[PDB]
């Protein structure tokens, strides 16, 4: 929770939207993944969103399915992922670090313990891709108890009940998935004092970062896009790091205005 209140406050003083990139931990291997993520940060990512490889990611598109398989081909497991989360937090003490999990990875050895281990290593949020609000009671309660914000997706046709729920249950940020006008979903999430909105899915050029700020959101999240850059330059790690720094620098300069 705190790091994200600090960062949104800080960004509001500067009239700047946040730019949050997503990567799968351990893709394409643990050492490469660590250098990808110090690169994203030095280039200006405001927060990271980071996924732990799960054998059955029923909520992910193809780019992210292939990122999982690559991490599995290198042998990555949840345990190494929590190892990597500790080293990333030891180097970067203020960046907000959010995880994208599947339910069985959290429920596996006890839902309280999993949110304890995130508290220990210094994670600030977890969004559980297959837990809808109606199933979310134990996972939100537990996350709350360990000072970790539970993130919810707010879909684009959300009825009023759901808006009300998502605003009441979530913290840190509201994941505002890109019928139903922006300008309505955004106003209503402010009205119900929801966590600040981040718009995500489909976000892959600077102009959409400027637009999401203008529409009233606090920033935007990009993942398929970052993940493709990895997928394209596997054979030349140095060029991978260059294209990622360029893309991230462009996206975060668009949030400045």
């Amino acid at each position: 929770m705190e790091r994200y209140e600090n960062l949104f406050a800080q960004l509001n003083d500067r009239r700047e939207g946040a730019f949050v990139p997503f990567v799968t931990l351990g893709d394409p291997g643990i050492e490469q993944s660590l250098k990808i993520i110090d690169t994203l940060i030095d280039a200006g990512a405001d927060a990271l969103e980071l996924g732990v490889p799960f054998s059955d990611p029923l909520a992910d598109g193809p780019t992210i399915q292939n990122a999982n398989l690559r991490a599995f081909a290198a042998g990555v497991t949840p345990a190494q992922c929590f190892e990597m989360l500790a080293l990333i937090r030891e180097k970067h003490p203020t960046i907000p670090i959010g995880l994208l999990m599947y339910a069985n990875l959290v429920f596996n050895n006890g839902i309280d313990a999993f949110y304890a281990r995130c508290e220990q290593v210094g994670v600030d949020s977890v969004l559980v891709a297959d837990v809808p609000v109606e199933e979310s009671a134990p996972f939100r309660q537990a996350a709350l108890r360990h000072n970790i914000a539970p993130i919810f997706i707010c879909p684009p046709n959300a009825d009023d009940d759901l808006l009300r729920q998502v605003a009441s249950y979530g913290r840190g940020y509201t994941y505002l998935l890109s019928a139903l006008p922006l300008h309505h979903l955004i106003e209503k999430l402010k009205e119900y004092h929801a966590a600040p909105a981040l718009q995500g899915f489909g976000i892959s050029s600077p102009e959409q970062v400027s637009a999401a700020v203008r529409a009233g959101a606090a920033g935007a999240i990009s993942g398929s896009a970052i993940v493709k850059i990895i997928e394209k330059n596997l054979a030349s790690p140095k060029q991978m790091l260059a294209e990622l720094r360029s893309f991230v620098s462009a996206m975060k300069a668009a949030s400045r205005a």
Partner: protein, 394 residues
Amino acid sequence: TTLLNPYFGEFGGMYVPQILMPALNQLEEAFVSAQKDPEFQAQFADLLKNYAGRPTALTKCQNITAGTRTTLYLKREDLLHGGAHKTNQVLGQALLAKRMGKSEIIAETGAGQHGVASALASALLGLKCRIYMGAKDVERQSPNVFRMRLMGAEVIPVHSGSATLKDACNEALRDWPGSYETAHYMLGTAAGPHPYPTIVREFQRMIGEETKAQILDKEGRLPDAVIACVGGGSNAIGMFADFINDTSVGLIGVEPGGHGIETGEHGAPLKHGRVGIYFGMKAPMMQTADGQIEESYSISAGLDFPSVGPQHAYLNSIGRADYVSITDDEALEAFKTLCRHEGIIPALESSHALAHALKMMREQPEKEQLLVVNLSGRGDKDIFTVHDILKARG
């Protein structure tokens, strides 16, 4: 908020991404309304009489039981059109798909049986069918593949994850949120998110209700035990349902033991896996210490699902049904017994259900007992597999 319960004690629920919720809820309301709808109930009763061939006979197997005190009957869903019980509930999920105004069907399949089924009901009822099959299941099931294309379905192979039944179930759930306003996701077992375990039970439940009336008329009392194989749970819960409240009747579900429980190469998560949440639901799964989901292993394609229907985990937890396991060997024996003694070639799935009934008789041959086995399909699809085995050994 839901109209009916999503859970059977601890197990069940709707563990899906938020953007699939409205498709579930819309299904559940369509189903509630159809179940009180007398017109819908007559339309489904007429398809299953005149098209699929209900009621299915109850055959006495006197040759297999001679010289014991076992009376064994075989409920014959192998005689239903398409050769397995999977036909009962596709007719009903397609009729629901029509009642919602849909024009399109999504389906997942492993060995190809449920793929067929949902291709024939979509052909009869004027739906446009597309199916997802893992590529590994593609390549080894070219017979099924061609049948679904004969019957006008579009078939899509899934190369992700392990490229088998579960990676199929995953691609189903990914397409439906972009399409649920004209496309119905026609799940093929009593498992996945609510409302799918309840709906598949209630569109399979006539297995049980005709078994009760057919034993009452032939023997004048109820079975000591009904017996069925358990891959995801639908034919078994269809057999058991109408007997859960006749507490002297035995409900026995049989899981695949593969190479044997101790080799770890099996499909028996209900008694040998651990509670997890995967495919929409909280139920027993085949998974690592770490929580990744695994494949089941069975000589039988049809039982290879590394989880199980939640209503089965519930009736195991309260001791109203019991669950056991039969090995690839055991089931190959029971398949050769029935072909040579009764002139009925059973599916390798149903052969595990019969394997356990033959051990029930062979173990205690002078126990007086009335036994019904649900013979959930025929076994023509399986004779190359059994000839290849028998050949490999001599």
